[PDB]
Design a binder for this molecule. Structure first.
Ligand code: BTN
Ligand code: BTN
Ligand code: NA
Lengths: 107, 107
């Protein structure tokens, strides 16, 4: 399996990419100031050539953060460049969706 | 068993949400000016309370658009409000990602 670590120290663990492009994996968040660190969270998404999307549900056996992240990005020159959006359960405005950029490199 | 149509007339068909919150279904794009109209594309994502992510691979046996869209949003007052990001195979810049807002009502 295929591990990718971003600038914050978080790691995407890719367990499979189906011939359909269906991606399955887990994620360990290590980003300072966020909840749900150091423990595995499930990943689903798509790979289409060098394009990728993947999303993480922030609940597991031990810690919940009432939120989901979706990454949209692309593989080029040894890195996956992504834009992410994080939505909190019970939100009432797109104003409350949090966003940023993660760069992932092989680890 | 759960269909949602946006302001552009596109429809998200949620076929199942697992107890894990894993979403599966298909999507029929009817958004003027885009490719991959009128035929079902596959959906994966997560539901967490009122929070939802889903992502469509724009590949099927009928037409392919070499792209992926990821939606991030929430259910509120009977509609799903979403921000989306569309990435194209072979992209080299975050500048080439396209973004928008979709609002879905039950259909
Ligand atoms: O705090 C939460 O609501 C759960 C953890 C969120 C981690 C975010 S997801 C986008 C960014 N990328 C990371 O590697 N960590 C943060
Ligand atoms: O044109 C492509 O690259 C394939 C289809 C993209 C359709 C987009 S996804 C975001 C927006 N919401 C829709 O209902 N359709 C467009
Ligand atoms: Na790949």
């Amino acid at each position: 399996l295929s591990a990718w670590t971003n600038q914050s120290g978080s790691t995407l663990y890719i367990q499979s990419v189906d011939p359909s492009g269906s991606l399955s994996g887990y994620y360990i968040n290590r980003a300072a100031g966020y909840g749900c660190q150091n423990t595995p969270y499930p990943v689903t998404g798509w790979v289409y050539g060098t394009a990728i999307t993947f999303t993480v549900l922030w609940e597991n056996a031990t810690e919940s953060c009432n939120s989901i992240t979706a990454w949209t990005g692309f593989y080029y020159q040894g890195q996956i460049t992504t834009l992410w959006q994080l939505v909190i359960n019970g939100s009432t405005s797109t104003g409350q969706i949090i966003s940023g950029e993660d760069i992932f490199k092989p680890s």
